[PDB]
Amino acid sequence: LPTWSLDSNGEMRSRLSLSEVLDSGDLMKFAVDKTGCQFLEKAVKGSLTSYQKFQLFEQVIGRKDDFLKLSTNIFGNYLVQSVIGISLATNDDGYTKRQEKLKNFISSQMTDMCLDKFACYVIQSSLQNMDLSLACKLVQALPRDARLIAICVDQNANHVIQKVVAVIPLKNWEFIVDFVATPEHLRQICSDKYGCRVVQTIIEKLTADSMNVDLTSAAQNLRERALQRLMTSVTNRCQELATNEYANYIIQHIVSNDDLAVYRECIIEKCLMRNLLSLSQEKFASHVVEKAFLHAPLELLAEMMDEIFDGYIPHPDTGKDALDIMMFHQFGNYVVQCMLTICCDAVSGRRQTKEGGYDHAISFQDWLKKLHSRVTKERHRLSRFSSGKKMIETLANLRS
RNA sequence: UGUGCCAUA
């Protein structure tokens, strides 16, 4: 802090005016000090004369290097966001030059700003506040190479991509969809703590749900094709994604979303079907298997049920079947729990059984009888486990 | 008995 602004005991004075600071040339020193920047932020919320705005515009967002220094600064980034707001709210003659300048500064340093812990907020702020045409240019400044992967999996920058998806029309960021759909890229991003959320946010945006009813038909077609391209890559590697610690969340989202029913069916027969016993014993894929059971169309549900009850050859020595393995498996037990709950909901009216021009109630009745018969017979061993006790209880609960 | 992310003074 400048000595002219400090008192005797070394504290920033109290009757300090915004214009004093703007006239002094010492703003950069204020903006990077906590007390200083705190004063500036209160002061810029108030009434501002045309000249005060003019000075703030030149000093905070007028020169590239001071703009970057403040944007990447723990305190300064708030002053930058605030001055950008004021700039956008000031329809004077210098408006245009001012916003073009801002777009040029950011575009030129896009990657480094997105990866930065503080300047990422400046990017996100600009994306939703700037005129859309200019905001679109910022997106255009995103990298198209390895740096893009790095952006998607970064703890800060991932929020920039999610913001883009939220506030910029698809046409401008379609390159991101196609970038992420390339096999090697899909693998790295989906298998990452932050990347898997980015990919889900993208899928959600590409979904023709009640949030997208505002789109023109032309826009819908654009969305549908981008969705098709991304889903194709997801279905071709879905085995790998379902079994992954992070990417299983994406597959679950797809499987559990009615507005994605066509891709739900694809996934089920592409990697789940015929692998149900195997996947039900996987830490991560078992959650996907539950989702498939909960949301499968009745025709596919019948095949899933049949595969469990009769799709596998019992152990040649003991006679343990699929159901035996799963009921007692550390992960598989949740799947059988899931199967039982589905049937109990169906036969008690808590779940619609009518689908495809037919009432499948007799099918649920059949499956329930199989499960009840197994639980009855194995009730003593099952009593030893929480899962088994829960099943016995579920059946007991149904009787009454 | 079984998994994540949702981030600034």
CSV table of C-alpha atoms (C1' of nucleotides) in Angstrom, one decimal:
chain,number,residue,atom,x,y,z
A,1,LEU,CA,0.0,0.0,0.0
A,2,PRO,CA,1.1,3.6,-0.9
A,3,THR,CA,2.3,5.5,2.1
A,4,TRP,CA,-0.1,8.4,1.3
A,5,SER,CA,-3.0,6.2,2.0
A,6,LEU,CA,-1.7,4.8,5.4
A,7,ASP,CA,-2.3,6.4,8.7
A,8,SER,CA,0.1,6.8,11.7
A,9,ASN,CA,-0.3,3.3,13.1
A,10,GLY,CA,0.2,1.8,9.6
A,11,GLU,CA,-3.4,1.2,8.7
A,12,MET,CA,-5.2,2.2,5.5
A,13,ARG,CA,-7.0,5.5,6.2
A,14,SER,CA,-10.8,5.5,6.6
A,15,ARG,CA,-12.1,8.6,4.8
A,16,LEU,CA,-10.5,7.3,1.6
A,17,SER,CA,-12.2,8.2,-1.7
A,18,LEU,CA,-12.3,6.2,-4.9
A,19,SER,CA,-11.1,9.2,-6.9
A,20,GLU,CA,-8.1,9.7,-4.7
A,21,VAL,CA,-7.1,6.1,-5.5
A,22,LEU,CA,-7.9,6.4,-9.2
A,23,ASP,CA,-6.0,9.7,-9.6
A,24,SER,CA,-2.9,8.5,-7.7
A,25,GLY,CA,-1.8,5.8,-10.2
A,26,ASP,CA,-1.6,3.4,-7.3
A,27,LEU,CA,-4.7,1.2,-8.1
A,28,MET,CA,-2.7,-1.9,-8.8
A,29,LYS,CA,-1.3,-1.8,-5.3
A,30,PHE,CA,-4.8,-1.5,-3.8
A,31,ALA,CA,-6.3,-4.2,-6.0
A,32,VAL,CA,-3.8,-6.9,-4.9
A,33,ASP,CA,-4.1,-6.1,-1.1
A,34,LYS,CA,-7.1,-7.6,0.7
A,35,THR,CA,-8.1,-4.4,2.6
A,36,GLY,CA,-7.3,-2.4,-0.5
A,37,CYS,CA,-9.3,-4.6,-2.9
A,38,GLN,CA,-12.1,-4.8,-0.3
A,39,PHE,CA,-12.4,-1.0,-0.3
A,40,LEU,CA,-12.4,-0.8,-4.1
A,41,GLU,CA,-15.1,-3.4,-4.4
A,42,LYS,CA,-17.4,-1.6,-2.0
A,43,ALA,CA,-16.6,1.7,-3.7
A,44,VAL,CA,-17.4,0.4,-7.2
A,45,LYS,CA,-20.8,-0.9,-6.2
A,46,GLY,CA,-21.9,2.7,-5.5
A,47,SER,CA,-22.8,5.6,-7.8
A,48,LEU,CA,-20.0,6.3,-10.2
A,49,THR,CA,-19.5,9.3,-12.3
A,50,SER,CA,-18.6,9.0,-16.0
A,51,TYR,CA,-15.0,9.8,-15.3
A,52,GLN,CA,-14.6,7.4,-12.5
A,53,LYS,CA,-15.9,4.6,-14.8
A,54,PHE,CA,-13.4,5.8,-17.5
A,55,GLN,CA,-10.5,5.5,-15.1
A,56,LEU,CA,-11.6,2.1,-13.9
A,57,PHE,CA,-12.0,0.9,-17.4
A,58,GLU,CA,-8.5,2.0,-18.4
A,59,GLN,CA,-6.8,0.8,-15.2
A,60,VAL,CA,-8.5,-2.5,-14.6
A,61,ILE,CA,-9.5,-3.7,-18.0
A,62,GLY,CA,-7.7,-1.3,-20.4
A,63,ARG,CA,-4.2,-2.8,-20.5
A,64,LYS,CA,-3.5,-6.5,-21.2
A,65,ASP,CA,-0.8,-7.0,-18.6
A,66,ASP,CA,-2.5,-5.3,-15.6
A,67,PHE,CA,-5.7,-7.1,-16.6
A,68,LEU,CA,-3.9,-10.4,-16.5
A,69,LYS,CA,-2.2,-9.6,-13.2
A,70,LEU,CA,-5.5,-8.7,-11.6
A,71,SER,CA,-7.4,-11.7,-13.2
A,72,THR,CA,-4.8,-14.2,-11.9
A,73,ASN,CA,-4.8,-12.5,-8.5
A,74,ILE,CA,-6.5,-13.9,-5.4
A,75,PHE,CA,-8.1,-10.5,-4.6
A,76,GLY,CA,-8.0,-8.7,-7.9
A,77,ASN,CA,-10.1,-11.2,-9.9
A,78,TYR,CA,-13.2,-9.9,-8.0
A,79,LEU,CA,-12.4,-6.3,-9.0
A,80,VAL,CA,-12.0,-7.4,-12.6
A,81,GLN,CA,-15.3,-9.2,-12.7
A,82,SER,CA,-17.0,-6.2,-11.1
A,83,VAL,CA,-15.4,-3.7,-13.6
A,84,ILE,CA,-16.5,-5.9,-16.5
A,85,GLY,CA,-20.0,-5.8,-15.2
A,86,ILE,CA,-19.9,-2.0,-15.0
A,87,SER,CA,-18.4,-1.9,-18.5
A,88,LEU,CA,-21.3,-4.0,-19.9
A,89,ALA,CA,-23.7,-1.7,-18.1
A,90,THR,CA,-22.3,1.4,-19.6
A,91,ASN,CA,-23.6,2.1,-23.1
A,92,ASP,CA,-21.3,5.0,-24.0
A,93,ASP,CA,-19.2,5.6,-27.1
A,94,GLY,CA,-16.3,3.5,-25.9
A,95,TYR,CA,-18.5,0.4,-25.2
A,96,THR,CA,-17.6,-1.4,-28.3
A,97,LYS,CA,-13.8,-0.9,-28.2
A,98,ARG,CA,-13.9,-1.8,-24.6
A,99,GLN,CA,-15.6,-5.2,-25.1
A,100,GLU,CA,-13.6,-6.1,-28.2
A,101,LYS,CA,-10.4,-5.3,-26.2
A,102,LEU,CA,-11.6,-7.6,-23.4
A,103,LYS,CA,-12.3,-10.4,-25.9
A,104,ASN,CA,-8.8,-10.0,-27.4
A,105,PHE,CA,-7.0,-10.1,-24.1
A,106,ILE,CA,-8.8,-13.2,-23.0
A,107,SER,CA,-8.6,-15.0,-26.3
A,108,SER,CA,-4.9,-14.5,-26.4
A,109,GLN,CA,-4.4,-16.1,-23.0
A,110,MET,CA,-7.4,-18.4,-23.0
A,111,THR,CA,-5.8,-21.7,-21.9
A,112,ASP,CA,-3.7,-20.2,-19.1
A,113,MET,CA,-6.6,-18.3,-17.8
A,114,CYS,CA,-8.9,-21.3,-17.7
A,115,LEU,CA,-6.3,-23.4,-15.9
A,116,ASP,CA,-5.7,-20.6,-13.4
A,117,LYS,CA,-7.3,-20.9,-9.9
A,118,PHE,CA,-8.7,-17.3,-10.0
A,119,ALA,CA,-8.8,-16.2,-13.6
A,120,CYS,CA,-11.2,-19.1,-14.4
A,121,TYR,CA,-13.9,-17.0,-12.6
A,122,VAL,CA,-13.2,-14.1,-14.9
A,123,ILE,CA,-13.7,-16.4,-17.9
A,124,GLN,CA,-16.9,-17.9,-16.5
A,125,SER,CA,-18.1,-14.4,-15.6
A,126,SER,CA,-17.4,-13.1,-19.2
A,127,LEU,CA,-19.1,-16.1,-20.8
A,128,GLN,CA,-22.5,-15.5,-19.2
A,129,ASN,CA,-22.4,-11.7,-19.1
A,130,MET,CA,-20.7,-10.5,-22.3
A,131,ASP,CA,-22.8,-9.9,-25.4
A,132,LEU,CA,-23.4,-13.4,-26.9
A,133,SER,CA,-21.6,-12.6,-30.1
A,134,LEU,CA,-18.5,-11.7,-28.2
A,135,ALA,CA,-18.9,-14.6,-25.7
A,136,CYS,CA,-18.9,-16.9,-28.7
A,137,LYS,CA,-15.5,-15.6,-29.7
A,138,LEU,CA,-14.1,-16.6,-26.3
A,139,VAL,CA,-15.2,-20.2,-26.8
A,140,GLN,CA,-13.6,-20.0,-30.3
A,141,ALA,CA,-10.3,-19.3,-28.5
A,142,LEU,CA,-10.3,-22.7,-26.8
A,143,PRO,CA,-7.5,-25.0,-27.7
A,144,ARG,CA,-8.2,-28.0,-30.0
A,145,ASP,CA,-5.3,-30.2,-28.9
A,146,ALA,CA,-3.9,-32.0,-25.9
A,147,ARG,CA,-4.4,-28.8,-23.9
A,148,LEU,CA,-8.2,-29.4,-24.3
A,149,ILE,CA,-8.0,-32.7,-22.5
A,150,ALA,CA,-6.0,-30.9,-19.7
A,151,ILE,CA,-8.7,-28.3,-19.5
A,152,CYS,CA,-11.5,-30.9,-19.2
A,153,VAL,CA,-9.8,-32.7,-16.3
A,154,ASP,CA,-8.5,-29.6,-14.4
A,155,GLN,CA,-10.1,-28.8,-11.1
A,156,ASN,CA,-10.6,-25.1,-12.1
A,157,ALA,CA,-11.0,-25.2,-15.9
A,158,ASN,CA,-13.6,-28.0,-16.0
A,159,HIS,CA,-16.0,-25.4,-14.7
A,160,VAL,CA,-15.2,-23.2,-17.7
A,161,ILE,CA,-16.3,-25.9,-20.1
A,162,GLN,CA,-19.4,-26.6,-18.0
A,163,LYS,CA,-20.2,-22.8,-18.2
A,164,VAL,CA,-19.8,-22.8,-21.9
A,165,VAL,CA,-22.2,-25.7,-22.3
A,166,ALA,CA,-24.7,-23.8,-20.0
A,167,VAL,CA,-24.6,-20.4,-21.7
A,168,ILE,CA,-23.4,-20.7,-25.3
A,169,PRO,CA,-25.4,-22.2,-28.2
A,170,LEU,CA,-24.2,-25.6,-29.3
A,171,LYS,CA,-23.0,-24.6,-32.7
A,172,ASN,CA,-20.0,-22.8,-31.1
A,173,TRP,CA,-18.8,-25.6,-29.0
A,174,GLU,CA,-19.6,-28.6,-31.2
A,175,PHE,CA,-15.9,-29.0,-31.7
A,176,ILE,CA,-15.7,-30.0,-28.0
A,177,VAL,CA,-18.3,-32.7,-28.4
A,178,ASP,CA,-16.4,-34.2,-31.4
A,179,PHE,CA,-13.1,-33.8,-29.6
A,180,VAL,CA,-14.3,-35.7,-26.6
A,181,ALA,CA,-15.9,-38.4,-28.7
A,182,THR,CA,-12.6,-39.5,-30.3
A,183,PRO,CA,-11.8,-42.9,-28.7
A,184,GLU,CA,-8.5,-41.9,-27.0
A,185,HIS,CA,-9.9,-38.6,-25.6
A,186,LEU,CA,-13.2,-40.2,-24.4
A,187,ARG,CA,-11.1,-42.7,-22.4
A,188,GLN,CA,-9.0,-40.1,-20.6
A,189,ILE,CA,-11.7,-37.6,-19.9
A,190,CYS,CA,-14.4,-40.1,-18.7
A,191,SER,CA,-11.9,-41.9,-16.5
A,192,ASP,CA,-11.2,-38.7,-14.6
A,193,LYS,CA,-12.8,-37.3,-11.4
A,194,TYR,CA,-13.6,-33.9,-13.1
A,195,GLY,CA,-13.8,-35.1,-16.7
A,196,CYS,CA,-16.7,-37.5,-16.0
A,197,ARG,CA,-18.8,-34.6,-14.7
A,198,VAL,CA,-17.9,-32.5,-17.8
A,199,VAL,CA,-19.0,-35.4,-20.0
A,200,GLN,CA,-22.3,-35.7,-18.1
A,201,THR,CA,-23.0,-32.0,-18.2
A,202,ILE,CA,-22.5,-32.2,-22.0
A,203,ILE,CA,-24.8,-35.2,-22.4
A,204,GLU,CA,-27.5,-33.4,-20.3
A,205,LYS,CA,-27.3,-30.4,-22.6
A,206,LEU,CA,-27.6,-32.6,-25.7
A,207,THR,CA,-30.7,-34.3,-24.3
A,208,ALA,CA,-34.1,-33.4,-25.7
A,209,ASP,CA,-35.7,-32.9,-22.3
A,210,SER,CA,-38.1,-30.3,-20.9
A,211,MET,CA,-35.2,-27.9,-20.6
A,212,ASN,CA,-34.6,-27.8,-24.3
A,213,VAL,CA,-38.2,-27.2,-25.5
A,214,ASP,CA,-37.1,-23.6,-26.3
A,215,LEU,CA,-34.9,-24.7,-29.2
A,216,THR,CA,-35.8,-24.2,-32.9
A,217,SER,CA,-36.2,-27.4,-34.9
A,218,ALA,CA,-32.9,-26.6,-36.7
A,219,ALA,CA,-31.2,-26.4,-33.3
A,220,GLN,CA,-32.9,-29.6,-32.2
A,221,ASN,CA,-31.4,-31.4,-35.3
A,222,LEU,CA,-28.0,-30.0,-34.5
A,223,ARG,CA,-28.4,-31.3,-30.9
A,224,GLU,CA,-29.5,-34.7,-32.1
A,225,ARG,CA,-26.6,-35.2,-34.4
A,226,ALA,CA,-24.1,-34.1,-31.7
A,227,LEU,CA,-25.8,-36.5,-29.3
A,228,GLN,CA,-25.6,-39.3,-31.9
A,229,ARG,CA,-21.9,-38.7,-32.4
A,230,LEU,CA,-21.1,-38.7,-28.7
A,231,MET,CA,-23.3,-41.7,-27.9
A,232,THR,CA,-21.7,-43.7,-30.6
A,233,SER,CA,-18.3,-43.4,-29.0
A,234,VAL,CA,-19.8,-44.2,-25.6
A,235,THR,CA,-21.5,-47.3,-26.8
A,236,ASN,CA,-18.4,-48.6,-28.6
A,237,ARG,CA,-16.3,-48.5,-25.4
A,238,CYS,CA,-19.1,-48.9,-22.9
A,239,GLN,CA,-17.7,-52.1,-21.4
A,240,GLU,CA,-14.6,-50.1,-20.4
A,241,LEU,CA,-16.6,-47.1,-19.1
A,242,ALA,CA,-19.1,-49.1,-17.1
A,243,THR,CA,-16.3,-50.8,-15.1
A,244,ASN,CA,-14.4,-47.6,-14.5
A,245,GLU,CA,-14.4,-45.8,-11.1
A,246,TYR,CA,-15.6,-42.5,-12.6
A,247,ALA,CA,-17.2,-43.4,-16.0
A,248,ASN,CA,-19.7,-45.7,-14.4
A,249,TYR,CA,-21.6,-42.6,-13.3
A,250,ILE,CA,-22.0,-41.5,-16.9
A,251,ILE,CA,-23.3,-44.9,-18.0
A,252,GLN,CA,-25.7,-44.9,-15.0
A,253,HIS,CA,-26.9,-41.5,-16.0
A,254,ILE,CA,-27.6,-42.7,-19.6
A,255,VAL,CA,-29.3,-45.9,-18.5
A,256,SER,CA,-31.5,-44.1,-16.0
A,257,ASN,CA,-32.6,-41.2,-18.2
A,258,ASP,CA,-36.0,-41.8,-20.0
A,259,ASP,CA,-35.1,-39.1,-22.5
A,260,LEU,CA,-32.2,-41.3,-23.5
A,261,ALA,CA,-34.2,-44.5,-23.8
A,262,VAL,CA,-32.8,-45.4,-27.2
A,263,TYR,CA,-29.2,-45.3,-26.0
A,264,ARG,CA,-30.2,-47.1,-22.8
A,265,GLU,CA,-31.4,-50.0,-24.8
A,266,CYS,CA,-28.2,-49.9,-26.9
A,267,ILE,CA,-25.9,-50.0,-23.9
A,268,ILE,CA,-27.8,-52.9,-22.2
A,269,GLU,CA,-27.4,-55.2,-25.2
A,270,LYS,CA,-24.0,-53.9,-26.2
A,271,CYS,CA,-22.1,-54.6,-23.0
A,272,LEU,CA,-24.5,-55.7,-20.2
A,273,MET,CA,-26.5,-58.5,-21.8
A,274,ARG,CA,-24.8,-61.9,-21.4
A,275,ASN,CA,-22.3,-60.3,-18.9
A,276,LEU,CA,-24.8,-59.8,-16.1
A,277,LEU,CA,-23.3,-62.3,-13.7
A,278,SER,CA,-19.8,-61.0,-14.3
A,279,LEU,CA,-20.6,-57.3,-14.1
A,280,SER,CA,-22.7,-57.9,-10.9
A,281,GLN,CA,-19.5,-58.9,-9.2
A,282,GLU,CA,-17.7,-55.7,-10.1
A,283,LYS,CA,-17.4,-52.9,-7.6
A,284,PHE,CA,-18.3,-50.2,-10.1
A,285,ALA,CA,-20.3,-52.1,-12.8
A,286,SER,CA,-22.7,-53.6,-10.2
A,287,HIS,CA,-24.2,-50.1,-9.8
A,288,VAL,CA,-24.8,-50.0,-13.6
A,289,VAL,CA,-26.4,-53.4,-13.5
A,290,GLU,CA,-28.9,-52.2,-10.9
A,291,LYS,CA,-29.7,-49.2,-13.0
A,292,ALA,CA,-30.3,-51.4,-16.1
A,293,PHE,CA,-32.7,-53.6,-14.0
A,294,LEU,CA,-34.5,-50.5,-12.7
A,295,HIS,CA,-35.0,-48.8,-16.1
A,296,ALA,CA,-34.9,-51.5,-18.8
A,297,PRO,CA,-38.0,-51.8,-21.1
A,298,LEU,CA,-40.0,-54.8,-20.1
A,299,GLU,CA,-38.9,-56.9,-23.0
A,300,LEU,CA,-35.2,-56.4,-22.2
A,301,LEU,CA,-36.0,-56.8,-18.5
A,302,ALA,CA,-37.4,-60.2,-19.2
A,303,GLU,CA,-34.2,-61.2,-20.9
A,304,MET,CA,-32.1,-59.9,-18.0
A,305,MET,CA,-34.3,-61.8,-15.5
A,306,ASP,CA,-34.0,-64.9,-17.7
A,307,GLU,CA,-30.2,-64.6,-17.9
A,308,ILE,CA,-29.9,-64.6,-14.1
A,309,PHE,CA,-32.4,-67.4,-13.5
A,310,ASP,CA,-31.4,-69.6,-16.4
A,311,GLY,CA,-28.5,-68.1,-18.4
A,312,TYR,CA,-25.7,-69.8,-16.7
A,313,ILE,CA,-24.5,-73.4,-16.0
A,314,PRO,CA,-24.4,-74.3,-12.3
A,315,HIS,CA,-21.0,-75.3,-10.8
A,316,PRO,CA,-20.3,-78.9,-12.0
A,317,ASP,CA,-19.4,-80.0,-8.5
A,318,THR,CA,-21.6,-78.1,-5.9
A,319,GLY,CA,-24.5,-77.1,-8.1
A,320,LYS,CA,-24.3,-73.4,-7.2
A,321,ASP,CA,-26.0,-71.3,-9.8
A,322,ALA,CA,-25.8,-67.6,-10.8
A,323,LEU,CA,-28.4,-66.6,-8.2
A,324,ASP,CA,-26.5,-68.5,-5.5
A,325,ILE,CA,-23.3,-66.7,-6.4
A,326,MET,CA,-24.9,-63.3,-6.5
A,327,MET,CA,-27.1,-63.5,-3.3
A,328,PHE,CA,-23.9,-64.0,-1.3
A,329,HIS,CA,-21.5,-61.8,-3.2
A,330,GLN,CA,-20.1,-58.6,-1.6
A,331,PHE,CA,-21.4,-56.6,-4.6
A,332,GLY,CA,-23.8,-59.1,-6.3
A,333,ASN,CA,-26.1,-59.1,-3.4
A,334,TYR,CA,-27.3,-55.6,-4.1
A,335,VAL,CA,-28.3,-56.7,-7.6
A,336,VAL,CA,-30.5,-59.5,-6.4
A,337,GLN,CA,-31.9,-57.1,-3.8
A,338,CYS,CA,-32.7,-54.8,-6.7
A,339,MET,CA,-34.4,-57.6,-8.7
A,340,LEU,CA,-36.6,-58.6,-5.7
A,341,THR,CA,-37.6,-54.9,-5.1
A,342,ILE,CA,-38.6,-54.5,-8.7
A,343,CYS,CA,-40.9,-57.5,-8.5
A,344,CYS,CA,-42.5,-56.6,-5.2
A,345,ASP,CA,-43.2,-53.1,-6.5
A,346,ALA,CA,-44.8,-54.6,-9.6
A,347,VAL,CA,-47.1,-57.0,-7.9
A,348,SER,CA,-48.2,-54.5,-5.3
A,349,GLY,CA,-49.1,-51.8,-7.8
A,350,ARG,CA,-46.2,-49.5,-6.9
A,351,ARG,CA,-44.9,-50.0,-10.5
A,352,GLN,CA,-46.6,-49.9,-13.9
A,353,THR,CA,-46.6,-53.4,-15.4
A,354,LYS,CA,-48.4,-52.4,-18.7
A,355,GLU,CA,-46.1,-51.8,-21.6
A,356,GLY,CA,-45.9,-52.6,-25.3
A,357,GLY,CA,-49.6,-53.3,-25.6
A,358,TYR,CA,-49.5,-55.8,-22.8
A,359,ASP,CA,-49.8,-56.3,-19.1
A,360,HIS,CA,-46.6,-58.1,-18.0
A,361,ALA,CA,-47.9,-58.7,-14.5
A,362,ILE,CA,-47.7,-62.5,-14.9
A,363,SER,CA,-44.0,-62.1,-15.7
A,364,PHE,CA,-43.3,-60.2,-12.5
A,365,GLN,CA,-45.4,-62.8,-10.7
A,366,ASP,CA,-43.2,-65.6,-12.1
A,367,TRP,CA,-40.0,-63.8,-11.2
A,368,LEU,CA,-41.2,-63.2,-7.7
A,369,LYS,CA,-42.2,-66.8,-7.2
A,370,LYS,CA,-38.7,-67.9,-8.3
A,371,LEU,CA,-37.0,-65.5,-5.8
A,372,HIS,CA,-39.4,-66.3,-3.0
A,373,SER,CA,-38.8,-70.0,-3.5
A,374,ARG,CA,-35.0,-69.5,-3.4
A,375,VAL,CA,-35.1,-67.3,-0.3
A,376,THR,CA,-37.5,-69.7,1.4
A,377,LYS,CA,-35.1,-72.7,0.7
A,378,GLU,CA,-32.0,-70.8,1.6
A,379,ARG,CA,-33.5,-68.8,4.5
A,380,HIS,CA,-31.1,-70.1,7.1
A,381,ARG,CA,-27.9,-69.2,5.4
A,382,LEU,CA,-29.4,-65.9,4.2
A,383,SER,CA,-30.3,-65.1,7.8
A,384,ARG,CA,-26.6,-64.7,8.5
A,385,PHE,CA,-26.3,-61.6,6.3
A,386,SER,CA,-27.8,-58.2,6.3
A,387,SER,CA,-28.7,-58.5,2.6
A,388,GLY,CA,-30.4,-61.9,3.3
A,389,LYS,CA,-32.3,-60.5,6.2
A,390,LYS,CA,-33.5,-57.6,4.1
A,391,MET,CA,-34.8,-59.9,1.4
A,392,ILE,CA,-36.6,-62.1,3.9
A,393,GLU,CA,-38.1,-59.0,5.3
A,394,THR,CA,-39.1,-57.6,1.9
A,395,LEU,CA,-41.0,-60.8,1.2
A,396,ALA,CA,-42.6,-60.7,4.6
A,397,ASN,CA,-43.6,-57.1,4.1
A,398,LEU,CA,-45.3,-58.0,0.9
A,399,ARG,CA,-47.6,-60.7,2.5
A,400,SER,CA,-49.2,-58.0,4.6
B,1,U,C1',-22.2,-55.3,3.7
B,2,G,C1',-20.7,-51.7,-2.2
B,3,U,C1',-18.0,-45.7,-5.8
B,4,G,C1',-16.9,-39.6,-7.6
B,5,C,C1',-17.0,-34.2,-8.7
B,6,C,C1',-19.9,-29.5,-7.4
B,7,A,C1',-14.0,-25.4,-7.0
B,8,U,C1',-11.9,-18.1,-4.9
B,9,A,C1',-10.5,-13.1,0.0
